[PDB]
Amino acid sequence: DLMALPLRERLIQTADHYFRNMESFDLETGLTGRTADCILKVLPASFGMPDRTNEECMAAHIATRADMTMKNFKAWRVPGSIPIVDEANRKVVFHMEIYAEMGDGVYHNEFIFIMTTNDEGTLLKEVAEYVDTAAEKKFAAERMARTKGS
Amino acid sequence: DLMALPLRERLIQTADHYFRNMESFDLETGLTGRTADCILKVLPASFGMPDRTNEECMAAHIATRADMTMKNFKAWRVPGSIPIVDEANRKVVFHMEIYAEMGDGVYHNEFIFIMTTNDEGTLLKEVAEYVDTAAEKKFAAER
Ligand SMILES: [Ca+2]
Ligand SMILES: [Ca+2]
């Protein structure tokens, strides 16, 4: 039971669940551990990715399913990093790396993630990720030079 | 007095000082509010900028004054954001934009800053910034 956990640990578990969900992702189970109005933010705004609802994130996942296979998604905290928890603000900050096998190659970058939970600290209300814009523009470019469906 | 403030507010003020120091930066006063062993980290590692001591930061500040004039440095939090403070870990996280005027170009980008203070919450022990790598590489190539 999450509510038996100390608030600090509860926030970390609930924030961490985002990466476990992505690691075990199945279209038949969808995005779990989120509030109905949870929003995903992609920083910086200069990258041009608009804020997205649970449903819009689902549509992105469904869309890329048809264009590229995704396998072996892996998320880990950068070694030596510790979760930054602001209990009063229901916020958790991780320093993260994400790995995945996309089509014929490796996706792998480094991120800042900022989670915000509901008042109870049991569901994610907002996910924000600051992204490696040079890497992501390059990935997007190679993606555009690729035949849809491989 | 800083030790008169509650820790949360003292951590924010110590973290915030970094940007006020940058805004009024003067070679003859240098980098204030930092422990002597303070380290500036520039994320992501893929950007290829190595960690720097107080003195290596001053060196870079000095080396840039000869190539281009910098004026009207302004730092502000992204509206709607709040400082994220982890009292136990002496950590503060800001969502920031930074503005400056160079050899007639505007510099302006959005960042995450992560500050770590000393145990008293009076001085900066570490500053980490996650930068906009597409834009910072452009900028660095333009020079
Ligand atoms: Ca990478
Ligand atoms: Ca910019």
Contacts of A81 (CB under 8 A, 6+ apart): A94, A95
* CA distance linking residue B49 with residue B131, whole number of Å: 11
> Which of A50, A57, A44 has its CA nearest to residue A133?
A44
**What tokens were used for A54?**
């649970």
Q: How far, rounded to the nearest angstrom, does the alpha carbon of residue B73 sit from its chain's CA centroid?
A: 12
Domain boundaries, chain A: 2-144
CATH class of B2-142: alpha beta
- Specify the length of chain A in residues: 150
The residues of B whose Cβ lies within 8 A of any Cβ of A are 8, 43-47, 82, 84-86, 88-89, 91, 93, 95, 109-112, 114, 130, 132-135, 137
Q: Where are the alpha helices (DSSP H) in B24-107?
A: 54-67
CA distance A10 to A7: 5
Closest-CA residue to B93 (of B111, B116, B118, B114)? B114
For residues B111 and B96, give the distance between their C-alpha atoms in angstroms, rounded to a whole number.
5
Rounded to 10°, the helix B133-142/A133-144 angle is 100
Smallest CA-to-CA distance from A18 within A1, A40, A37 is with: A40
Q: Which residues of A touch B133 (CB under 8 A)?
A: 132-135
For tokens 């490796």, what's the residue?
A106
Cβ distance B46 to A133 less than 8 Å, yes or no, reads: no
Q: Are B18 and B33 in contact (CB under 8 A)?
A: yes
Q: Which residue of A has its CA nearest to B82?
A: A89
Query: For tokens 């982890």, what's the residue?
Result: B86
Fold of A2-144: Nuclear Transport Factor 2; Chain: A, (3.10.450)
Q: A8 to chain B: which residues are within 8 Å by CB? A: 88
Q: What is the separation of C-alpha A147 from the centre of its chain, rounded to a whole number of angstroms? A: 26
CA-closest candidate to residue B12, choices B86, B75, B99: B86
Structure tokens at A56: 């819009």
DSSP state of A24: T
C-beta separation of A90 from A121 below 8 A: yes
**Cβ atoms of B46 and A110 closer than 8 Å:** yes
CA distance A141 to A106: 15
| CA-based torsion, B12, B14, B18, B19: positive or negative | positive
Which amino acid is residue B141, in one-letter code?
A: A
**Residue B50 C-alpha from the chain's centroid:** 15
Q: Which of A47, A85, A110 sits opposite B43 (nearest CB)?
A: A110
Beta-strand ranges (E) seen in A44-83 are 52-53, 70-77
